[PDB]
Amino acid sequence: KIRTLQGRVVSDKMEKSIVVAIERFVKHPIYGKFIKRTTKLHVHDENNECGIGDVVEIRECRPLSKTKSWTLVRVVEKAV
Amino acid sequence: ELQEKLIAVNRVSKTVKGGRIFSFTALTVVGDGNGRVGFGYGKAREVPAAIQKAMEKARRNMINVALNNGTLQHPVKGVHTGSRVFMQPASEGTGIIAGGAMRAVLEVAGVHNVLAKAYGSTNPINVVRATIDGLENMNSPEMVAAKRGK
Amino acid sequence: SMQDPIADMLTRIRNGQAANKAAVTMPSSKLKVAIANVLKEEGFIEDFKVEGDTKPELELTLKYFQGKAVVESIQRVSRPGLRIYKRKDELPKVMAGLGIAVVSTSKGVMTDRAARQAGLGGEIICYVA
Amino acid sequence: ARYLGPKLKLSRREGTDLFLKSGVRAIDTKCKIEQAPGQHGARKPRLSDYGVQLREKQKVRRIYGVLERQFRNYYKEAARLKGNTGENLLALLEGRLDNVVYRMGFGATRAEARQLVSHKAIMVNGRVVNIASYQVSPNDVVSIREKAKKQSRVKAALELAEQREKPTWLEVDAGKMEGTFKRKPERSDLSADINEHLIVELYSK
Amino acid sequence: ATVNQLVRKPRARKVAKSNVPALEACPQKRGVCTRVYTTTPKKPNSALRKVCRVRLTNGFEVTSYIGGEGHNLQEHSVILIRGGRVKDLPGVRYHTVRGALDCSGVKDRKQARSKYGVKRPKA
RNA sequence: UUUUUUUUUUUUUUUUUUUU
RNA sequence: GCUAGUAGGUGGGGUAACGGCUCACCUAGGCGACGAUCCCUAGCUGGUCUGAGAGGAUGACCAGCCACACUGGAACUGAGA
RNA sequence: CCGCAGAAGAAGCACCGGCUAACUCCGUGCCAGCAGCCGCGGUAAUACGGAGGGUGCAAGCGUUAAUCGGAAUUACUGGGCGUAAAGCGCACGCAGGCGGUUUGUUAAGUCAGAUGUGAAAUCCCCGGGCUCAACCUGGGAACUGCAUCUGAUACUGGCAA
């Protein structure tokens, strides 16, 4: 019952966190092209196995600090 | 028992060398009440002589409009330089609510359920030419049923 | 024609069919051959054939009645991204009842009538009339 | 407020054989059509394509005696109704209370019949509905009340209608004076000589 | 047929040209009588017509016509203002429905009925 | 495709009604 | 051209419940021409003055919000101010 | 509601061009004057201004402050590029728009359904209670989306080739 977005790893700073931000899949009443605007997917990583370069699946978890909800699940699109 | 009506006229009278000149014109429509409609132009030295010459030309053959029963089953294109034009049938029961600028050309045959007013031009000549020259381009029920059969 | 898949299918049956031919032939495509089929089985064309089976060409017997195009009143209304998806009772009902349109939906390409009766909405390809 | 007269002035422009005064002596011989009813312009009048529908709103407005009020408030719902302009409008003016009682013969003139119905001399199944725009729908009933039922004017109608065409759309009793519409009026046999669709096309001009 | 000359006046006889500048809110207003005049030599020899100025805040100075009969329309008053700048008047861009306050306007003109508001004569 | 034999000539007011 | 506990970690503290909601601290991180600064100008909704109606437009019936009642900011006393 | 007593007690303004609509007999000289698009008056003024009659309509009649009418115009639903206005001498690449078309596969958008929301006065239809118009109303419905799931696969995007 998880909401499973397809996140490009698009920033790394924190020892046990990553930013997997892609487009904001909640739409609104408009012309007829795709919803191509970002949302801030902040994620408590710990294995760090996906690094910089995969696309990762994720799931809804507690904000143990400043709204940082999600955790990692699996590699949707491998390594490039 | 044919039906015989004017639609339009010119004032047509200008300056010259020299004083003034004038003329008398007419644009008229004729029909036969089972379904047949037609149109004709004329001129004379005189008013009714122009109407005469015009109606005499209007009496030529008259296109049997595809009516079944009180009105017609397709928007047949009246193609002209932008008139566009089309008419719209009404559900055989309410009247000829057409443009009084061109209604004549359907009341001479008693077409009782057709509407559309003067679409893209404020001139009765523009639509009355457009219609008769595109009414010849009609298809029978048996022709639309060959076009979608044999 | 690649900027609008599969639009040339409705232009080519207008062109050749005005232009004195009983025939037209072209490469086949993922929606065109179903359109060719429905156009025959309603009877707006006399036949279609498909030829060179392993990489086939697609061929239609146009209906050169009075030397004028049967598909003169036609319009292809759904366009790239700005699609035309309509509900089972929003569908076309044109020419005061005489019809018709050709659509596609959850059972293939078909007429709007046959769509309305199966109770389905769909992709409005063209108003045939 | 429905105009009152000179009542034969209405005939001198609305035209021949009107109901408004049906009955005696005046008919033809003083409504002056074919003689010259408008003497000064009589030599060469004209009409208009709109004007000729206008005189036929006038036909309907004066032959039945109804206000501009009612012409708008019957057309108000005639955009909701399902038939022709002749059903939607002209039929109702033929079968509103002050008109249906004339039609059966409870009065002799189509201007007397309104005065009667506002005077509490008629009912609808018991209802003394002086609100005479109230329209009496089929198989339910309209009667002169007891103490007015054979009262002079009634017999000046019923002995005079006897020689004329009585319609089938409605049925009456002529000796105890009560009735209804036995069907809806029909644009064929409604016997008003009017082109019954002119009065709504007159809005489109 | 040379339209730059032709458009100015050509065959209409109401001729629509009216010049009505200024706005800043609405035209139908109250107007203080500010300071009376009857000065200015013109071609229409305007007689007894005290045409005064109004303290309208509109970006320039403006004036009003006396709008109807009754000779006293004093400088201390405050009447109603409306359009209708007859060809006669230079500078002015309004007239006035002026029988408010004590300025009276129509005196015993039985004919005035619904145009100004007067009662019946002797039937 | 060289085309300066003098430059200028005040406002009016003509104007046979009208729907077709 | 906009950030300041604002952006992220540290970890102290307390919210019925989240968090720079935030202090202190180590470092400088956060936004932007796929509208960041900043101001317009506004009562907004079901409805409806007007309906193929798509547009022009109003927010005011009933209430729903608010927000008051002198300019009121605000604490207390009370389930409820 | 039922007897007396009497049509008794109850109406008028625009105005009258031409717009839906009825016209003349007269005045004052672009006087005074309506001024909405038009039109009227420049000593023969059909409505300026008086008057006679009659007219539209009848608790009504003209008209006014705004703005869309008719009139087609900000146009996913709705468009004109010779015209009003209308492919801007010119395209180095940076982001962006369209990315060649079909197999094996997929259903998030596509579409249909089952179930929820929109208690009550809608819009849109009937049946009625008052004498009844109204009014008082009850009954019958339709609500694109969003929710939670069952499916049907022709597009939209993808996945492997």
Short mmCIF file of C-alpha atoms in Angstrom, two decimals, chain A:
data_model
loop_
_atom_site.label_atom_id
_atom_site.label_comp_id
_atom_site.label_asym_id
_atom_site.label_seq_id
_atom_site.Cartn_x
_atom_site.Cartn_y
_atom_site.Cartn_z
CA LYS A 1 0.00 0.00 0.00
CA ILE A 2 3.22 2.13 -0.40
CA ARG A 3 3.29 5.04 -2.86
CA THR A 4 6.53 4.01 -4.65
CA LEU A 5 7.99 6.87 -6.72
CA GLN A 6 10.92 6.30 -9.29
CA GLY A 7 13.63 8.58 -7.93
CA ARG A 8 16.84 9.79 -9.72
CA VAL A 9 19.53 10.31 -7.01
CA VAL A 10 19.98 14.08 -7.63
CA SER A 11 21.83 15.17 -4.47
CA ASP A 12 24.16 13.62 -1.79
CA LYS A 13 25.51 15.54 1.31
CA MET A 14 24.35 13.70 4.55
CA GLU A 15 26.17 10.50 6.10
CA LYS A 16 22.73 8.70 6.24
CA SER A 17 20.61 10.62 3.67
CA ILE A 18 20.02 11.26 -0.16
CA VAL A 19 17.70 13.48 -2.38
CA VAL A 20 15.85 11.33 -5.01
CA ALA A 21 13.72 14.17 -6.42
CA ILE A 22 11.63 13.62 -9.67
CA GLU A 23 8.32 15.18 -11.02
CA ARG A 24 5.28 15.82 -8.70
CA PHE A 25 2.67 13.10 -9.75
CA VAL A 26 -0.32 15.00 -8.05
CA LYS A 27 -1.96 16.78 -11.10
CA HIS A 28 -4.32 19.80 -11.58
CA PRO A 29 -6.89 20.95 -14.23
CA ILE A 30 -4.79 22.18 -17.28
CA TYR A 31 -3.99 21.88 -21.08
CA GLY A 32 -2.73 18.25 -22.04
CA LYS A 33 1.15 17.69 -21.50
CA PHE A 34 2.79 15.72 -18.59
CA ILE A 35 3.04 17.12 -14.95
CA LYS A 36 6.78 18.12 -15.43
CA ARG A 37 7.52 20.12 -12.16
CA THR A 38 9.62 18.73 -9.19
CA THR A 39 8.84 17.53 -5.69
CA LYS A 40 11.48 17.32 -2.89
CA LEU A 41 11.88 13.50 -2.29
CA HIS A 42 14.18 13.60 0.85
CA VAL A 43 15.25 10.08 2.02
CA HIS A 44 16.92 8.38 4.98
CA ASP A 45 19.42 6.13 3.12
CA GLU A 46 21.83 3.96 5.17
CA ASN A 47 23.23 1.22 2.91
CA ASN A 48 24.43 3.96 0.35
CA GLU A 49 24.62 1.14 -2.35
CA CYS A 50 22.76 3.40 -4.91
CA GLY A 51 25.34 6.27 -4.62
CA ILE A 52 24.76 8.77 -7.50
CA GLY A 53 23.72 6.91 -10.59
CA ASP A 54 20.76 4.44 -10.19
CA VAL A 55 17.03 5.23 -10.23
CA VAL A 56 15.50 4.06 -6.88
CA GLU A 57 12.09 2.93 -5.53
CA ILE A 58 11.17 4.09 -1.98
CA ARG A 59 8.39 3.91 0.74
CA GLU A 60 6.68 6.04 3.37
CA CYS A 61 8.39 6.03 6.83
CA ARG A 62 8.68 8.38 9.92
CA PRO A 63 10.29 11.94 9.69
CA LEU A 64 12.91 11.17 12.39
CA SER A 65 14.19 14.69 11.50
CA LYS A 66 12.96 17.82 9.48
CA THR A 67 10.20 16.25 7.31
CA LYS A 68 12.60 13.61 5.91
CA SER A 69 9.95 10.79 5.57
CA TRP A 70 10.92 8.12 2.96
CA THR A 71 13.31 5.01 2.98
CA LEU A 72 14.93 3.11 0.04
CA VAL A 73 13.42 -0.18 -1.39
CA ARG A 74 15.01 -1.26 -4.72
CA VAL A 75 16.83 -0.23 -7.89
CA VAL A 76 14.17 0.57 -10.60
CA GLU A 77 16.80 1.48 -13.36
CA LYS A 78 20.40 0.13 -12.91
CA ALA A 79 23.59 2.25 -12.58
CA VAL A 80 23.47 4.86 -15.55
#
